[PDB]
Every structure is written in structure tokens, then in C-alpha cells.
Design a protein around this ligand. Structure first.
Ligand SMILES: CC(=O)N[C@@H]1[C@@H](O)[C@H](O)[C@@H](CO)O[C@H]1O
Ligand SMILES: CC(=O)N[C@@H]1[C@@H](O)[C@H](O)[C@@H](CO)O[C@H]1O
Ligand SMILES: *[C@@H]1O[C@H](CO)[C@@H](O)[C@H](O)[C@H]1NC(C)=O
Lengths: 70, 49
């Protein structure tokens, strides 16, 4: 898919493309397959979701979220 | 796109292909998604030209 909704806003990968094996969703570079966990620091935000076509539903994990409670 | 020129061909959705060109000329890829309709209308009208 081209993009994934998180909360109202859209997200796009910095490089490579988003892929899915049916189980989950990941991001990878286009010339060599090596899937990676989708994180905040691999994508960035622009506009809202209603503009774009083909967007899907998921959640973006924040590495800081489980450690901000410390 | 360029994959077949590299070697064994690989299919890819067309809009994704258009995205990486704009990545190649320095513009952020969100512009294409936000104005696909205008881009398509201009391309067809240019074919008319
Ligand atoms: C059908 C299948 O193979 N699912 C696996 C999944 O169990 C695993 O968590 C993931 C991460 O390696 O890769 C894929
Ligand atoms: C079939 C389906 O679940 N569509 C939902 C839609 O109802 C919801 O408004 C949107 C944001 O929550 O995500 C998607
Ligand atoms: C892809 O093409 C099919 C056939 O019309 C269509 O049903 C589908 O909605 C298209 N994909 C998206 C994300 O809209």
C-alpha cells in the first residue's frame, strides 16, 4: 500500500516501501529484502488521510513510549 | 520502471513508480499523492497538445 493511517494524519516512509506478508506490516529498501519494524523514526507526516488513495489502517510504534514512564 | 532494464522484470504499482521520480528530483513524495488528479488531467491534455 502507499500509506498507513495512525490518527487522522498520514505517514510516509523516508525511503523504500511498505510491505506486508499478511501477518503484519513492515518497511524495506527496494533493492534488497530485509524487513524492519515500523517505527516513528522511519516515516514522517504530511497533510491528512482523506486526500490520498489506497491508505490502510494500523498503528505506529514509538520507541520512546515504553521508556517515557521512567 | 527500471527493474527490467536492470535484469529480470519486476511488477510495481504505477503510482508508486511515479513517486520515485519526484523523489529523484528532490521534491517530497507527498505532493504526488495530494495532487494526482491534477497531474493526470495535465498529462492527458498534453497528449492532446
Ligand atoms: C506466516 C509467518 O511466517 N509469520 C511470521 C511471524 O510469525 C513472525 O513473527 C514475523 C517476524 O519474523 O515474520 C513472519
Ligand atoms: C471498514 C473500516 O473499518 N473503516 C474505518 C473507518 O470506519 C474509520 O472511520 C477510519 C478511522 O477510524 O478507519 C477505517
Ligand atoms: C485496485 O483496483 C480494483 C479494481 O477496480 C479496485 O477495486 C481497488 O479499489 C483498487 N485498489 C485501491 C486501494 O483502491
Amino acid at each position: 500500500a502507499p500509506a498507513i493511517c495512525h490518527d487522522g494524519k498520514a505517514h510516509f516512509p523516508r525511503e523504500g516501501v511498505f510491505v506486508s506478508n499478511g501477518t503484519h506490516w513492515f518497511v524495506t529498501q527496494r533493492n534488497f529484502y530485509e524487513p524492519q519494524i515500523i517505527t516513528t523514526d522511519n516515516t514522517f507526516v504530511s497533510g491528512n488521510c482523506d486526500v490520498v488513495i489506497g491508505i490502510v489502517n494500523n498503528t505506529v510504534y514509538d520507541p520512546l513510549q515504553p521508556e517515557l514512564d521512567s | 520502471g527500471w527493474t527490467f532494464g536492470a535484469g529480470a522484470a519486476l511488477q510495481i504499482p504505477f503510482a508508486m513508480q511515479m513517486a520515485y521520480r519526484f523523489n529523484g528530483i528532490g521534491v517530497t513524495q507527498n505532493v504526488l499523492y495530494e495532487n494526482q488528479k491534477l497531474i493526470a488531467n495535465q498529462f492527458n491534455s498534453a497528449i492532446g497538445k
